[PDB]
Design a protein around this nucleic acid. Structure first.
Length: 67
DNA sequence: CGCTAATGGGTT
DNA sequence: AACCCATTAGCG
């Protein structure tokens, strides 16, 4: 049942990282490439981890908007 | 299970 | 390139 393609380990975000990602999201639902890279740098996260966090946060946000 | 990080497969 | 968003899957 295991994938043939290697998947990345699941990142566990710190409370500090989640607090800052949530503050960023409340302010701006979409980030410029520069604002995203800068946030990744400030939090010692990868660009992709921040990009994906934003994407999955927008999914969650759209589901709450629908109720 | 529930939440949500990462990925698939297609769109913008 | 980044997004959309259904899906796959890790873990408390």
């Amino acid at each position: 049942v295991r994938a043939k393609k290697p998947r990345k380990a699941r990142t566990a975000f710190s409370d500090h990282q989640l607090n800052q990602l949530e503050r960023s999201f409340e302010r701006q639902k979409y980030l410029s490439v520069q604002d995203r890279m800068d946030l990744a740098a400030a939090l010692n996260l990868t660009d992709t981890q921040v990009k994906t966090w934003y994407q999955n946060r927008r999914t969650k946000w759209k589901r709450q908007t629908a109720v």
